[PDB]
Design a protein around this motif. Structure first.
Motif, short mmCIF file in Angstrom:
data_model
loop_
_atom_site.label_atom_id
_atom_site.label_comp_id
_atom_site.label_asym_id
_atom_site.label_seq_id
_atom_site.Cartn_x
_atom_site.Cartn_y
_atom_site.Cartn_z
N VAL A 74 -3.74 -28.71 29.58
CA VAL A 74 -3.89 -28.98 28.16
C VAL A 74 -2.56 -28.74 27.47
O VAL A 74 -1.94 -27.68 27.65
N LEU A 75 -2.10 -29.72 26.70
CA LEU A 75 -0.88 -29.61 25.93
C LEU A 75 -1.19 -29.81 24.45
O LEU A 75 -2.07 -30.60 24.09
N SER B 283 2.30 -33.82 19.32
CA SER B 283 2.22 -34.27 17.94
C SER B 283 1.02 -35.16 17.68
O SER B 283 0.69 -35.40 16.51
N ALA B 284 0.36 -35.66 18.71
CA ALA B 284 -0.86 -36.43 18.55
C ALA B 284 -2.11 -35.57 18.66
O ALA B 284 -3.22 -36.10 18.60
N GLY B 285 -1.96 -34.26 18.82
CA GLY B 285 -3.08 -33.34 18.89
C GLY B 285 -3.05 -32.54 20.18
O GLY B 285 -2.09 -32.56 20.94
N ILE B 286 -4.14 -31.82 20.42
CA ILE B 286 -4.31 -31.06 21.64
C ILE B 286 -5.10 -31.92 22.61
O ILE B 286 -6.19 -32.41 22.28
N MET B 287 -4.55 -32.13 23.81
CA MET B 287 -5.19 -33.04 24.75
C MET B 287 -4.69 -32.76 26.16
O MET B 287 -3.67 -32.12 26.36
N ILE C 119 2.73 -26.72 26.67
CA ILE C 119 1.55 -26.45 27.48
C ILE C 119 0.82 -25.23 26.94
O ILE C 119 1.42 -24.16 26.76
N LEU C 120 -0.47 -25.40 26.63
CA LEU C 120 -1.29 -24.27 26.22
C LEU C 120 -1.90 -23.57 27.43
O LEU C 120 -1.64 -22.39 27.66
N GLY C 121 -2.68 -24.30 28.20
CA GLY C 121 -3.32 -23.72 29.36
C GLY C 121 -3.82 -24.78 30.30
O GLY C 121 -3.30 -25.90 30.33
N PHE C 122 -4.83 -24.42 31.07
CA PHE C 122 -5.41 -25.32 32.05
C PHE C 122 -6.85 -24.91 32.31
O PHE C 122 -7.26 -23.79 31.99
N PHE C 123 -7.60 -25.83 32.89
CA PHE C 123 -8.96 -25.54 33.33
C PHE C 123 -9.31 -26.47 34.48
O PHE C 123 -8.91 -27.64 34.49
#
Lengths: 180, 141, 129, 30, 82, 218, 56
Positions: free
Chosen positions: C102-103, C106-110, C124-128
């Motif tokens: 998950v990143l 500028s187009a949002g979190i996706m 990069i925020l995280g992963f799942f």
RNA sequence: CUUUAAAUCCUUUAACGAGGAUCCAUUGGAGGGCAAGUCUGGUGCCAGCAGCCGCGGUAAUUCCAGCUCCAAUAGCGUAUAUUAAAGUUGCUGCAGUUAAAAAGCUCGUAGUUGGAUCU
């Protein structure tokens, strides 16, 4: 300063473990089956296959519509089917990873001379090519490692000056004729 | 634990660079004192003049007299002890002649039975010990 | 003290999924936590969740379908270009057939696949997976 | 000569490696 | 499980825990597969039907097998409300 | 001949169970190696990984026994690993082979990238652990073979894994822990819930309750 | 710790002259001979899986 | 002949040129690591081998040799520096109860990090 070029490269890789029994047996099987001289020929074909696999593996991480992937993958596939290692029906980048070392060893001029019947054994094929008896199209080829293209397979004759295909007896025959 | 911050590059780099000194191989190769104490002076081989033949008693479990020679290196005059490898090979070396000497294969450490000897004689009188051992070459007369 | 509330949220979800619990409470809530949760739920990992709207900072009750192997945060939020995405995928994800990075772009979190489709990088925020 | 008990009464002696190698050669000879 | 040609390639498809919805291992021997007999609505006897509940060994070890089976039965109508 | 001692063995001997997968699907324990012979007992090939002498000090010296580590498995989908300690080496090897047969697990195989052909590699990165030895298996592109040490390479090849990357940490020198760790990593392949296994499970009729009358009248 | 015995065992080992044996093949022929010995024929085996240089 | 400023090779033609095709392939090894002999003769903790574990004090699977075997091969061994191995410098990615290791304790400036919220 010199006008010379120092560009050169090594064409094989020495294995990491020198005395692996399975590796030794497989390499000896390849040498005996294709009539090679040493393990360096096996390792050379291994190196070319590894480089082709590396290029394909890198190209398979790109997007399927990436113009560089399209151009380079198409070129690589065209090259692989040109020398007959890859069937033109299987012309996707993922089929490059399915090629073995024996597919590249099959295209050698030694193997092809043995297969087309110009020689009785693979070692006979090697000594034939090395003794200027085999020509490809119109060119005498002394190199058993010569990789025969698909368009060149149909033209592997017995040379126009070889005793076996051209019509001039060798030294031994001429001397034996002179004896009598 | 360890700092994980976008602006911790200086801290991480400095900590790694400081801690690398506590590594023995790095400290050897980068301090330079071990290079100063090396009789070869960083060279792989060195020529010397043999000053005497000595017999070095082996280590505790084994029992043999290893044949070595004290040699004084030409480049700096440092005295070292070089093991003459094969058998009957000490008979190929005379006093005050010139030998080539290489390391023992452990980068300045003793090897096996021989205590405190970290060199081996490779040549003597410009002919290798192997050429004299196998009879291919004779000592100049 | 409490920095990176997303790390706490993801760790709570992970610890609750490991124990087999069917619901987890996340507090505090935030826009980034809700966006990450929506990215999870679109791919069918957690299911529906509720936002208890206490009048200082929300809480969330997340239902837990037993499909989430791991969820984690990447700290610090490294800035990731489009070329580094494949390296990040190799590092974090168990396979090329499933699992998302998950990143915030500028187009949002996706997820990383969506960012590749949109042709944009981010952080990069995280992963799942 | 039998590797099986050669290994059973030589694995502590000077010949541990040789008898072990022979025993593994008997077991999987290829 | 499916390749690009669409055929199924798995050796077998494992069963999942009815409570935690996790894969039950092939060598996890504490797991159980319990059949609860379905009872006819009117006469209240065994009509040959049953509901099958698979519980993994971790849940049983933890002690939550009771709650899991009771909840699954309640959600299936075998156990009355409350 | 084979007179089964357990219900599962009796069902297997009577052609009741169609495949080993019907045992695995219900996590049934196997207590007779003759079941493994009955199902895979033509493609199974064993391999004695190691013979090591263990010694227990006694009043009059050391009592020496020999422990055999033996890996078994057809080179397609199945593998097992058995360790047995005995006074005689041949007895230890026989016991180890029986234990390896009893421990055979299914190995789930997946694809690295695209999904052409039969599976060749592990479906995801898996990890097995045994007493400080950690073995990590990583999917690899088709044709790279096993990139591993010889000991995990034997088990991975004998499990049908065509190509795989591996990593190892810890005292891998101890062959027993190395082999147990890579076997654990292999056996975790079917216990990893990938999104292709999300579809709700359909419960079938258990072997004991399916042929229940076959044992009622027997 | 004397140096007087330095070539003792080598000096007193009874010299044996090497036999006159036939030259071995070299290159491709030697590899073909190895391949034939090891993979084509199983003549010297007794079914016991010994070594190539086994004297027992 | 051709080459080339000048035959300074390669290529091309021709003469002679192989049966031990004597027109004779070597360099390191054979206990393990590690591929390949607890065969024979000699020495007897000596001489020596052995990178490491180890061999040798009268059957030495390890020394000196003969035979045989295997590894690479017109190449192979050795010394040194360096890279991978080394997740034994760890950003990815290590450790700190007992194996090496958390400052005696608290305060505190730089440094590092910093809760929700605004379409």
């Amino acid at each position: 300063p010199v006008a010379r070029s120092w560009v050169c490269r090594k064409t094989y890789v020495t294995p990491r473990r020198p005395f692996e029994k399975s590796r030794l047996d497989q390499e000896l099987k390849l040498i005996g089956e294709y009539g090679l001289r040493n393990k360096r020929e096996v390792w050379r074909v291994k190196f070319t296959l590894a480089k082709i696999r590396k290029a394909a593996r890198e190209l398979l991480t790109l997007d399927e519509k990436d113009p560089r992937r399209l151009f380079e993958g198409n070129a690589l596939l065209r090259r692989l089917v040109r020398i007959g290692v890859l069937d033109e029906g299987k012309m996707k980048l993922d089929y490059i990873l399915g090629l073995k070392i024996e597919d590249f060893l099959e295209r050698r001029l030694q193997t092809q001379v043995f297969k087309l019947g110009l020689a009785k054994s693979i070692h006979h094929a090697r000594v034939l090519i090395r003794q200027r008896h085999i020509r490809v199209r119109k060119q005498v080829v002394n190199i058993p490692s010569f990789i025969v293209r698909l368009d060149s397979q149909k033209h592997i004759d017995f040379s126009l000056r070889s005793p076996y295909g051209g019509g001039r007896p060798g030294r031994v025959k001429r001397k034996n004729a002179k004896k009598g | 634990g360890k700092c994980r911050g976008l602006r911790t590059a200086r801290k991480l780099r400095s900590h790694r660079r400081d801690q690398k000194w506590h590594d023995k191989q790095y400290k050897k190769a980068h301090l330079g004192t071990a290079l100063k104490a090396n009789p070869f002076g960083g060279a792989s081989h060195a020529k010397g003049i043999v000053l005497e033949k000595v017999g070095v008693e082996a280590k505790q479990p084994n029992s043999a007299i290893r044949k070595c020679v004290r040699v004084q290196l030409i480049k700096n005059g440092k005295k070292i002890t070089a093991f003459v490898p094969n058998d009957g090979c000490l008979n190929f070396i005379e006093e005050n002649d010139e030998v080539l000497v290489a390391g023992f294969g452990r980068k300045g450490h003793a090897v096996g039975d021989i205590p405190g000897v970290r060199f081996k004689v490779v040549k003597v009188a410009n002919v290798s010990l192997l050429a004299l051992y196998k009879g291919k070459k004779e000592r100049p007369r | 003290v409490r920095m990176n509330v997303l790390a706490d949220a993801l760790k709570s979800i992970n610890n609750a999924e490991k124990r087999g619990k069917r619901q987890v409470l996340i507090r505090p809530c935030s826009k980034v936590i809700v966006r990450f949760l929506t990215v999870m739920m679109k791919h069918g990992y957690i299911g529906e969740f509720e936002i208890i709207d206490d009048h200082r900072a929300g809480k969330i009750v997340v239902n837990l379908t037993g499909r989430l192997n791991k969820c984690g945060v990447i700290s610090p939020r490294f800035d990731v270009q489009l070329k580094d995405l494949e390296k990040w995928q190799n590092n974090l994800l168990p396979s090329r057939q499933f699992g998302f990075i998950v990143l915030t772009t500028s187009a949002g979190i996706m997820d990383h696949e969506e960012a590749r489709r949109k042709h944009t990088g981010g952080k990069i925020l995280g992963f799942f997976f | 000569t039998d590797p099986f008990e050669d290994f059973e009464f030589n694995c502590n002696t000077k010949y541990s490696g040789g008898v072990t190698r022979n025993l593994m050669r008997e077991l999987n000879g290829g | 499980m499916q390749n690009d040609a669409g055929e199924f390639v798995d050796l077998y498809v494992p069963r999942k825990c009815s409570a935690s919805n996790r894969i039950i291992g092939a060598k996890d021997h504490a797991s159980i597969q319990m059949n609860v007999a379905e009872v006819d609505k009117v006469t209240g006897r065994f009509n040959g039907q049953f509901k099958t509940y698979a519980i993994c060994g971790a849940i049983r070890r933890m002690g939550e097998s009771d709650d899991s089976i009771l909840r699954l039965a309640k959600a299936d109508g075998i156990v009355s409300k409350n | 001949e084979w007179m089964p001692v357990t219900k599962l063995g009796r069902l297997v001997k009577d052609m009741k169970i169609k495949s080993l997968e019907e045992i695995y699907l219900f996590s049934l324990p196997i207590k007779e190696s003759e079941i493994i012979d009955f199902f895979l007992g033509a493609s199974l090939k064993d391999e004695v990984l190691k013979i090591m002498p263990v010694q227990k000090q006694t009043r009059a010296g050391q009592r020496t026994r020999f422990k055999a580590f033996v890996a078994i498995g057809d080179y397609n989908g199945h593998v097992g690993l058995g360790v047995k300690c005995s006074k005689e080496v041949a007895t230890a090897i026989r016991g180890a082979i029986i234990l390896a047969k009893l421990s055979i697990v299914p190995v789930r195989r997946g694809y690295w990238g695209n999904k052409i052909g039969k599976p060749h590699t592990v479906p995801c990165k898996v990890t097995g652990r045994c007493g400080s030895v950690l073995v990590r298996l990583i999917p690899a592109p088709r044709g790279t073979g096993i990139v591993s040490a010889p000991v995990p390479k034997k088990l991975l090849m004998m499990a049908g894994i065509d190509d795989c990357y591996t990593s190892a940490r810890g005292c891998t020198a101890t062959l027993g822990n190395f082999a147990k760790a890579t076997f654990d990593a292999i056996s975790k392949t079917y216990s990893y819930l990938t999104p292709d296994l999300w579809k709700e499970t359909v419960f079938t009729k258990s072997p004991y309750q399916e042929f229940t009358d076959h044992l009622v009248k027997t | 710790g004397s140096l007087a015995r330095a070539g003792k065992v080598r000096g007193q080992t009874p010299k044996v002259a090497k036999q006159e044996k036939k030259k071995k093949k070299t290159g491709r022929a030697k590899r073909r001979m190895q391949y034939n010995r090891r993979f084509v024929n199983v003549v010297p085996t007794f079914g016991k899986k010994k070594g190539p240089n086994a004297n027992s």
